[PDB]
UniProtKB/Swiss-Prot annotation, chain D:
Protein name: Flavin-dependent thymidylate synthase
Gene: thyX
Organism: Thermotoga maritima (strain ATCC 43589 / DSM 3109 / JCM 10099 / NBRC 100826 / MSB8)
Cofactor note: Binds 4 FAD per tetramer. Each FAD binding site is formed by three monomers.
Known pathway: Pyrimidine metabolism; dTTP biosynthesis
Active site: 170 (involved in ionization of n3 of dump, leading to its activation)
């Protein structure tokens, strides 16, 4: 079980592990050891249709995610899940930042060329980072110095989430009303979910999924 | 599938598991031997339990409804149970379950009387079904020692809390037994975490004297 | 102040509530501070676009008396807090839901409905009698009680926020749920409407997935 | 009841359901002796029977820097609403540490100068943000250059048990100083509203240090 999808300039979503597959939901709904394709597919659709989503909780993913803090903050609002975020305490910290490409601004009619917007963002980021390093060099503790860093600082985290919670996540974030950056991560999550649970995923698209972009 | 028999007709069977002791080490370090084992200890020792949320089991449990009802109080877990609306076995305690208590009739007489009421209740239930009574109504006469089955999907942290509450002399003997089988499967799949849990975090009594 | 009798010896009683419809408006706006039409529109907007987090800031506590077969369906709702009666802090008592003949007319049976009631009552009586016999003999309660039927009444305190309550009404205030649980869910709905009228109507109009609360007043 | 924290922060009590007696009613499952009642509260707490305390609930209104809010929001057993432009006016303030914050640390650069550098960065980042907005960059993109010390506001609803778990993790000297201060304010309000429970918590269940010193 291993998949990686690159997101933004330096970000990613990688699959670390999975427990179960579409049949794990079939099994839990029946309380049985079944493994007959047709009737198992029908059952999955049937559960999805009638909003009987508990069986899908017995499918579980672990993801490793690299994303900017503004994205990670919205993400961590999903309470029915487990998070471990990068701290200095158990491994090395690094410092990269999401610089939007000029095409991110297309559609918006801006006073200055998109390339200049991109460059202004780079510049202010570079200044904050250099101030950060300055403070660290002077002996300011990391936990203080780091408050000058911008919301586009990349973080990394593991996320363990069951299929039901994942579908709820997709309903909120895989949507043209979500911020573009968020959507992009949600497409990656959907894509891995589709790979590992095609029947569940297709059933979710047909009957339960509330957004557009999938 | 590791499968452990409990009470007269019950069990705990392992359906699936995701990860192992290293799943917790990877998570704590956010990165895809004795060092890794030492990190587990260090985590458990300092109360940093979140890395263990990244290990997960699914169990198949057959238990008497009185035991299930206590078990289902553990909210940080997922359950799918057989429906009472849509087999019929009953936990009959052995005479030995009673020893330690002075009773005015002998233990084997207690066992017998339990069996008898179960028989009566079961037969009544069959008459009602036979008469057309729907099951969702007819079953309400069945006693709390009726066996049910369920799947249980639980992370290792929420599992250690469950072991904290149920693998302990102060819980009903019956659920201890189920908690011993759970401990046993946990220990098999996640030896380092399990030892570390006993040594630094486990608040109950029995697992420090009942092996596996 | 608010207690509703359910089944033959059951009830739903309201112990406490935090907040009202405006607790949800305040939370959506993140403002500790009133404009009825505008505030009602916000509640409709939240409910219509599926943003139900603001309703988590309204909370209820109930005291509920129900047969164990009902309680077990209820305790499957995990986004909530439960305190069930035990031998520890308070007195136990022993009562049972004996269904009336009406419960079964509608079903074609080969004995009269009253005969069903009579048979359920009998077996309850015998089970209970056996129980008290074992108790008098020294058998501890935790063992002796396993003979008692699933229609034994229990009590609990349930603390639940309005969002989680709405999910519960979705799943239980519905003709596909067992009739006994419908009846509890209708009492929970009535209270919830009395305290949070705006949220309860917006719920029905936009989010409610069941049948009965759209059929049956309060 | 409102407690000021950091330079522009606060914790304010919005609402509370119940008091010490709510846990006693719950434990006994009775809607129907002051000294008996405290004894039960100590008894519950010493034996780890903390479920009765779930029937006491608080709503807070908290103004805090994002770095703080991100650590706070990791407490999953609770309900949050964070300020959005969607339902209310947004504003732009930043946590500048006082020089006493560093006092304790041996720095190459005096504490007031650390304070000044943080302030300088904020001003520059904030001004870059404003330049972008003026240009026609949307807020959702422009705000990504803002530093982690930007204040945010949120409502937090949390039952007493979950609140005690929070105090265990954050009212402790190993927590970052800034969150400790919010944790002390939470604790004070807790103590005010639920004295018997708070007293019993310190005596039997509290795992931290600082609530026993202040
Ligand atoms: C941003 C956006 O507004 C949401 O806050 C965010 O996307 C997560 O919301 P959520 O509660 O659906 O996700 P989660 O917090 O993961 O919730 C997942 C599911 O659990 C339920 N849930 C979780 N916690 C609670 C709670 N305390 N009260 C009521 N329902 C809950 C939700 O209804 C949802 O269906
Ligand atoms: C029977 C016994 O009295 C308990 O009800 C049963 O063991 C479940 O206890 P629990 O809440 O610790 O388990 P669970 O319901 O699995 O909870 C386990 C852990 O999660 C926490 N938890 C889960 N839900 C809540 C909640 N709604 N409020 C506060 N804490 C919560 C508990 O503090 C505990 O440490
Ligand atoms: C009948 C049916 O079989 C269920 O047992 C019962 O309806 C419980 O439903 P529920 O999980 O929606 O309610 P609850 O268990 O109260 O759940 C309410 C909300 O919380 C969410 N939730 C709580 N725990 C989990 C979890 N472990 N995984 C995913 N979602 C969760 C659900 O998605 C749901 O929207
Ligand atoms: C920083 C620090 O590492 C934690 O991320 C932060 O303190 C969150 O703490 P918490 O999960 O204990 O609190 P919360 O996220 O509020 O959890 C409170 C309690 O509930 C339990 N809990 C909640 N969610 C889960 C879960 N998904 N799996 C297992 N246990 C859970 C924990 O045992 C804890 O005692």
């Amino acid at each position: 079980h291993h998949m990686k999808i690159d997101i933004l300039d330096k970000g990613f979503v990688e699959l670390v592990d999975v427990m179960g597959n579409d049949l794990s939901a079939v099994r839990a709904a029946r309380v049985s050891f079944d493994m007959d394709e047709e009737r198992d597919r029908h059952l999955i659709e049937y559960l999805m249709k009638h909003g009987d989503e508990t069986p899908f909780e017995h499918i579980v993913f672990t993801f490793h995610v690299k994303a900017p803090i503004f994205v990670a903050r919205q993400w961590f609002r999903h309470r029915i899940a487990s998070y471990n975020e990068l701290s200095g305490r158990y491994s090395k910290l690094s410092y990269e930042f999401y610089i939007p490409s000029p095409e991110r601004l297309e559609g918006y009619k801006t006073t200055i060329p998109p390339e200049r917007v991109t460059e202004k963002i780079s510049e202010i980021v570079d200044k904050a980072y250099r101030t950060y390093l300055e403070l660290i060099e002077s002996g300011v503790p990391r936990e203080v110095a780091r408050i000058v860093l911008p919301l586009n600082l990349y973080t990394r985290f593991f996320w363990t989430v069951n299929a039901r919670s994942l579908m709820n996540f997709l309903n909120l974030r895989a949507d043209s009303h979500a911020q573009w950056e968020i959507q992009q991560y949600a497409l990656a999550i959907a894509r891995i979910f589709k790979e590992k649970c095609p029947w569940t995923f297709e059933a979710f698209l047909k009957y339960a999924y509330k957004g557009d972009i999938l």
